[PDB]
Structure formats: structure tokens, C-alpha cells
């Protein structure tokens, strides 16, 4: 997260870290047994870390659960990153508490201008690399489809939304993928891709999760 702020500890209790030795992607807890992330974050083995704040220090309040199942959207396409959504089944259920909590799926698609909260442990520089120990947070609005399409001509499917600032300076970044964009208590976006980070006229592009509510509920109720 470039241009954001350090989140208060456990202030984003649906945020998880996906770990394959080290942190590499985010995700969101949607029920006690399942995390939603981006499909390009697939790895054959994934450890889900819940209740995290400092991913580099054991606070004694975290939960460490390996993935038992990892299911990428069947139509995921690594080249246009359409259908960039993934479900991870925890090998044992998460214990829900004030620091480990679910986030609601969307009741409905999110309108342009809706203010959102994006979070993650990704790069905090738009040039160079500075990876935080502590979870970062950014408030940012949903952008209209036309402005999103205008920013990335011929690249934004109907399964993608832009959230951010066309003037630059504030965006998600590498290491934030799979992480949540939550607006009015609803997970509306999944960090997916962008041209660099926090560049002018190149906002973040996010999976439009409201298109996936049927796939999500149903994939869970089969695996």
C-alpha cells in the first residue's frame, strides 16, 4: 500500500496473510473455513495467517492454518487476469474473535464514488521497495467504469473495477494482491493488478467480487 497509513492492530480482522515461507499475497476471511483471494496468488501449498498485524513478530494472538484446498476460478486467465479470484479452504476452521472476523460478501455491486478501505502488507513505495512489517490501510473511492476503461484501454473486463486516485500517490502495490477492498461492510474488490503502483492515471484494478457471489457460495457448498 503506497500512500496509506499503518492500520491500528487488528482493525481489519478479516485480513489474512498468505504465506509460502514468507508473506506473498493477501486474502479475506469470508467464513470460518474459507478465505477469498486472487487466482494469480495460487500456489500448491499455502499457509493462511489470521489475526496478524506484524507479520514479522509473533504477538501470541495469531492463527496459523494451512490450506487444505485451493480452488482457482475455472475461467481464470493468467493473461488478461479475468476472473482473478480464488478460494482457499482452511485445513481446520478459524476461531472467530474480535481480531479474527468474517467480512460480508456484497449484497450488491458498488457504485462509483463509494469510499472503500484497502489493506495489505505490500510495497509502500511507488519507486523502489519498502515492505512493511505492519499492516497498511488506505481509504479510496470506487472509480466509474468509463474512467477505469480510459485508464487501461482495452484491458478492463466486466469482472474488474478500479479503485483509487487518478492523480497518483495512493494505491495498492506488489504484496497486496488478493487482499480486500471493503466498502460499507462488504468485500467489493480483491487486489489484482495495475501498471506500476500509485502512478498518475493508472489506478489499481481489482476483481469485482459481486460477480462471484454465486460461484463463491456454491464452491464452498461443494468442497
Amino acid at each position: 500500500i503506497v500512500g496509506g497509513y499503518t492500520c491500528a492492530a487488528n482493525s481489519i480482522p478479516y485480513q489474512v496473510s498468505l504465506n509460502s515461507g514468507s508473506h506473498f499475497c493477501g486474502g479475506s476471511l469470508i467464513n470460518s473455513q474459507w478465505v477469498v483471494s486472487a487466482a494469480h496468488c495460487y500456489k500448491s501449498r499455502i499457509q493462511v495467517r489470521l489475526g496478524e498485524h506484524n507479520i514479522d513478530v509473533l504477538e501470541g494472538n495469531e492463527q496459523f492454518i494451512n490450506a487444505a484446498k485451493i480452488i482457482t476460478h475455472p475461467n481464470f486467465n493468467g493473461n488478461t487476469l479475468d476472473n482473478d479470484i480464488m478460494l482457499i479452504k482452511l485445513s481446520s476452521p478459524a476461531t472467530l474473535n474480535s481480531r479474527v472476523a468474517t467480512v460480508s460478501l456484497p449484497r450488491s455491486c458498488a457504485a462509483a464514488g463509494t469510499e472503500c478501505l484497502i489493506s495489505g502488507w505490500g510495497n509502500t513505495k511507488s519507486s523502489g521497495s519498502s515492505y512493511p512489517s505492519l499492516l497498511q490501510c488506505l481509504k479510496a473511492p470506487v472509480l466509474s467504469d468509463s474512467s477505469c476503461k480510459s485508464s487501461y484501454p482495452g484491458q478492463i473486463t466486466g469482472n474488474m473495477i478500479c479503485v483509487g486516485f487518478l492523480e497518483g500517490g495512493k494505491d495498492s502495490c506488489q504484496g497486496d494482491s488478493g487482499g480486500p477492498v471493503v466498502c460499507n461492510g462488504q468485500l467489493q474488490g480483491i487486489v489484482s493488478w495495475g501498471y506500476g503502483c500509485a502512478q498518475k492515471n493508472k489506478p489499481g484494478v481489482y476483481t469485482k467480487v459481486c460477480n462471484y457471489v454465486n460461484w463463491i457460495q456454491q464452491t464452498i457448498a461443494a468442497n
Binding site: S22, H23, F24, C25, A38, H40, C41, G78, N79, L81, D84, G122, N123, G128, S129, Y131, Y152, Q155, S172, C173, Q174, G175, D176, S177, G178, V191, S192, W193, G194, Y195, G196, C197, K202, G204, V205
Partner: peptide
Amino acid sequence: GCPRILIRCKQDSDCLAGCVCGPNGFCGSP
């Protein structure tokens, strides 16, 4: 664009499509 996954790299082929291996050994946009 470049997907926003964190990948430690030695050279560009370690990276997803649209990314290159950055000067600090992380994948990112050219």
C-alpha cells in the same frame, strides 16, 4: 500491467507476464 503478488526474483522469467525483475529482486512493472 503487473499483478500485485510479491515474488522474489533473480531474473525476469521468475515473474508473471507484464512484470520484470526489479533492481531490488522483486517482481514489478517495467
